[PDB]
Amino acid sequence: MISTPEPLHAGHILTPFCCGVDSIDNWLKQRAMKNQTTGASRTFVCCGSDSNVLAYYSLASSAVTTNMPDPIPVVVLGRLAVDKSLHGQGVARALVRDAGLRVIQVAETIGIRGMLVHALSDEAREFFQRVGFVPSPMDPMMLMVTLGDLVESV
Amino acid sequence: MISTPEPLHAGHILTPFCCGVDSIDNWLKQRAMKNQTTGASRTFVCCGSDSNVLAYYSLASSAVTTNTPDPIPVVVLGRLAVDKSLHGQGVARALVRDAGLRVIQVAETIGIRGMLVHALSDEAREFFQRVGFVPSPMDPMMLMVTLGDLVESV
Amino acid sequence: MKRETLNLRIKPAERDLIDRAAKARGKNRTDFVLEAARAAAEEALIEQRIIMADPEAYQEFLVRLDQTPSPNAALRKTMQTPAPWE
Amino acid sequence: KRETLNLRIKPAERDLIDRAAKARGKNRTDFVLEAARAAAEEALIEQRIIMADPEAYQEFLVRLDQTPSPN
Amino acid sequence: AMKRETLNLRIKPAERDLIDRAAKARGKNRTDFVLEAARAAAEEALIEQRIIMADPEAYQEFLVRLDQTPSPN
Amino acid sequence: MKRETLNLRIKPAERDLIDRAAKARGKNRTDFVLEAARAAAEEALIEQRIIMADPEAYQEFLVRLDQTPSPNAALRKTMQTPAPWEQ
Numbered sequence: 001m002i003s004t005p006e007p008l009h010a011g012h013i014l015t016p017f018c019c020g021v022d023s024i025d026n027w028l029k030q031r032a033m034k035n036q037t038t039g040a041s042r043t044f045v046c047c048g049s050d051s052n053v054l055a056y057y058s059l060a061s062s063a064v065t066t067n068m069p070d071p072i073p074v075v076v077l078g079r080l081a082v083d084k085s086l087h088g089q090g091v092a093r094a095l096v097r098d099a100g101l102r103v104i105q106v107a108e109t110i111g112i113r114g115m116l117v118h119a120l121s122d123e124a125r126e127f128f129q130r131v132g133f134v135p136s137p138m139d140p141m142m143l144m145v146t147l148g149d150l151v152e153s154v
Numbered sequence: 155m156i157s158t159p160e161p162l163h164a165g166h167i168l169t170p171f172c173c174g175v176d177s178i179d180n181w182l183k184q185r186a187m188k189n190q191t192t193g194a195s196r197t198f199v200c201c202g203s204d205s206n207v208l209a210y211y212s213l214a215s216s217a218v219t220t221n222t223p224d225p226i227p228v229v230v231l232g233r234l235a236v237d238k239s240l241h242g243q244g245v246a247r248a249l250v251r252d253a254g255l256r257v258i259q260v261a262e263t264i265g266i267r268g269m270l271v272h273a274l275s276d277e278a279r280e281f282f283q284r285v286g287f288v289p290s291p292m293d294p295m296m297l298m299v300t301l302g303d304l305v306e307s308v
Numbered sequence: 309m310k311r312e313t314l315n316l317r318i319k320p321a322e323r324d325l326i327d328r329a330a331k332a333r334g335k336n337r338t339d340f341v342l343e344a345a346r347a348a349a350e351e352a353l354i355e356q357r358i359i360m361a362d363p364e365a366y367q368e369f370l371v372r373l374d375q376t377p378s379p380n381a382a383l384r385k386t387m388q389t390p391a392p393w394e
Numbered sequence: 395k396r397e398t399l400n401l402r403i404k405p406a407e408r409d410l411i412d413r414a415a416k417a418r419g420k421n422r423t424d425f426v427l428e429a430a431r432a433a434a435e436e437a438l439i440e441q442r443i444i445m446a447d448p449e450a451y452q453e454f455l456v457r458l459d460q461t462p463s464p465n
Numbered sequence: 466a467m468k469r470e471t472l473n474l475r476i477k478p479a480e481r482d483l484i485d486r487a488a489k490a491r492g493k494n495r496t497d498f499v500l501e502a503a504r505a506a507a508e509e510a511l512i513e514q515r516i517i518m519a520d521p522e523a524y525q526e527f528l529v530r531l532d533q534t535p536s537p538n
Numbered sequence: 539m540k541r542e543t544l545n546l547r548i549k550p551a552e553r554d555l556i557d558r559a560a561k562a563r564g565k566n567r568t569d570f571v572l573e574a575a576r577a578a579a580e581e582a583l584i585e586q587r588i589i590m591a592d593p594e595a596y597q598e599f600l601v602r603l604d605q606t607p608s609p610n611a612a613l614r615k616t617m618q619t620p621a622p623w624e625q
């Protein structure tokens with residue numbers, strides 16, 4: 001059975017994680033623990049029976065601007081992936097909900113106004129649209145949920 | 155009085171360190187602890203009365219190779235700096251000796267054949283020549299000591 | 309779903325360094341370069357701390373942020389569906 | 395006069411690189427070649443110093459931190 | 466020919482020589498090395514101002530709250 | 539003093555982003571760019587995992603590595619002089 005999303009630490013077992021996208025498997029195994037300690041991003045993991053990561057996603061703080069207006073703080077949803085063992089069962093949708101609830105509970109600290117995600121393929125765009133993200137005016141492969149839509153959704 | 159060089163950790167106080175080269179002061183305060191944890195390089199510090207770093211240097215493993223054979227493992231002496239309070243008193247030369255003795259004690263593990271340093275100015279080249287480095291055939295601003303010269307020098 | 313050719317101007321010394329690295333990894337030259345570019349591209353996009361918008365796109369973005377909250381059905385289902393970790 | 399590296403690339407893979415290059419203010423060629431150069435240096439240092447003997451590399455790291463005593 | 470748009474630097478030759486060595490090491494031209502370094506530093510400077518230095522205490526609370534378990538209602 | 543002009547071809551949008559960052563730091567445009575270039579240059583040089591040699595330089599490097607060990611006076615003084623912390 002899959003544990004509650006918690007911050008990645010050195011006790012989590014990464015090697016067997018396979019979501020079917022090599023680069024996203026590699027990032028978890030090669031870069032995630034380093035990111036976690038340097039504070040580049042914050043990674044959250046679900047575990048199975050033996051501290052083995054079955055799923056993960058990363059959040060980072062970012063800002064949107066133009067051109068000199070004050071940039072808008074946003075949370076960027078980075079990589080998100082589920083072990084193939086758990087595909088087609090609402091786990092990824094539950095990770096997006098987990099991310100959305102984090103964004104709500106932190107939003108007023110530094111004035112987060114929404115959550116963005118960079119779709120890395122047409123497949124990912126379809127998936128992100130399918131759980132409630134919408135294309136941004138900046139880029140059709142850069143999707144968003146407003147803090148307003150998030151808060152009203154709960 | 156200045157402590158024995160030990161690996162940098164989070165308990166070391168970096169803010170007051172001033173060697174007179176901003177970029178080298180900044181690296182200690184901004185990048186050294188991050189490098190130490192990701193394992194990009196290994197940083198060694200001398201401390202004074204209150205766990206304040208008075209001096210530091212970094213070592214990293216590197217390799218030399220040729221254009222178009224097995225690359226030659228070397229230790230790179232990176233940034234090396236002494237608080238202005240301690241200038242002109244053999245501290246920096248003693249840090250180079252500390253580095254040289256580390257290189258000797260580790261050399262056989264992976265076949266280190268020498269120690270390199272990248273002179274960032276004519277001042278640094280003069281200093282590095284003054285404590286026993288010699289210009290490499292690759293680059294006059296890249297200086298070296300062979301493991302053979304190091305071992306025989308003790 | 310079809311394959312495009314990308315011809316990239318490269319110094320021979322840069323090409324020879326990639327061939328040595330591909331050899332060392334037991335990878336074909338094309339896979340070594342494409343896997344390296346894919347990994348770097350996802351990193352470049354995800355790690356953007358400052359996202360720059362064209363001015364017209366930026367004001368539409370601000371219009372949507374300020375708009376009367378109207379969550380679509382998909383987002384409602386995402387946020388109201390209890391997690392497998394209960 | 396111009397030396398080329400020839401890639402067969404899926405259009406979706408090319409489109410992701412163009413988005414990443416745009417975000418970095420680099421041209422497509424520079425983004426791909428800089429990424430390949432960085433990966434190549436990493437692949438070659440990892441082979442010669444870590445993967446030739448992982449156990450020797452860990453001992454190297456252990457011994458590097460130990461206090462040097464000349465006598 | 467269209468216009469060439471310029472950023473003009475007065476640079477000490479020893480500083481220029483250090484950039485040429487670093488660009489060489491990276492296989493980049495001098496212009497790209499300097500502009501890529503300035504772009505990366507500019508993005509860092511701007512995100513740090515708006516999100517950390519506008520209120521360092523608010524930023525730390527943000528980090529604290531981000532890790533706490535989300536519990537709707 | 540002994541300063542040269544370096545004229546760099548830049549997209550206006552890239553110039554304007556640097557000006558915004560320099561403003562935020564209370565820095566002059568030239569100092570922001572030169573400090574960023576200096577920091578990146580020392581990092582680029584120091585963190586070279588693979589140091590590439592021209593073939594002729596490489597064989598001289600190999601000759602020096604293999605040579606009969608003859609440590610110069612400066613190196614001998616460095617390695618034999620006790621540190622300030624050895625008491």
Ligand SMILES: CC(=O)SCCNC(=O)CCNC(=O)[C@H](O)C(C)(C)COP(=O)(O)OP(=O)(O)OC[C@H]1O[C@@H](n2cnc3c(N)ncnc32)[C@H](O)[C@@H]1OP(=O)(O)O
Nearest residue numbers: 019078081082087088089090091092093119120124127130
């Ligand atoms: C762009 C980034 O930041 S990373 C890119 C996204 N992640 C990856 O590509 C990694 C590899 N893939 C995976 O890990 C998974 O297949 C994921 C993350 C895409 C989805 O995992 P699942 O747990 O199977 O999704 P879940 O069961 O919660 O389904 C949620 C919704 O998305 C849909 N969906 C699931 N997989 C996909 C897919 N591959 N493409 C499109 N839509 C999908 C589901 O049908 C469902 O919508 P519905 O209510 O209309 O039925």
Ligand SMILES: CC(=O)SCCNC(=O)CCNC(=O)[C@H](O)C(C)(C)COP(=O)(O)OP(=O)(O)OC[C@H]1O[C@@H](n2cnc3c(N)ncnc32)[C@H](O)[C@@H]1OP(=O)(O)O
Nearest residue numbers: 173232234235236241242243244245246247274278280281
């Ligand atoms: C380039 C890299 O990768 S590391 C960068 C290192 N260089 C820097 O610019 C850092 C900033 N400066 C400093 O912190 C220091 O002044 C250092 C490291 C240059 C020297 O520190 P000190 O402790 O004063 O040197 P120390 O007292 O051990 O002197 C040893 C020898 O170096 C010489 N030396 C000291 N400072 C300098 C200098 N600025 N230029 C040239 N030679 C110098 C001494 O005269 C002595 O030679 P001698 O015995 O033949 O007279």
Ligand SMILES: [Cl-]
Nearest residue numbers: 471472473553
């Ligand atoms: Cl101008």
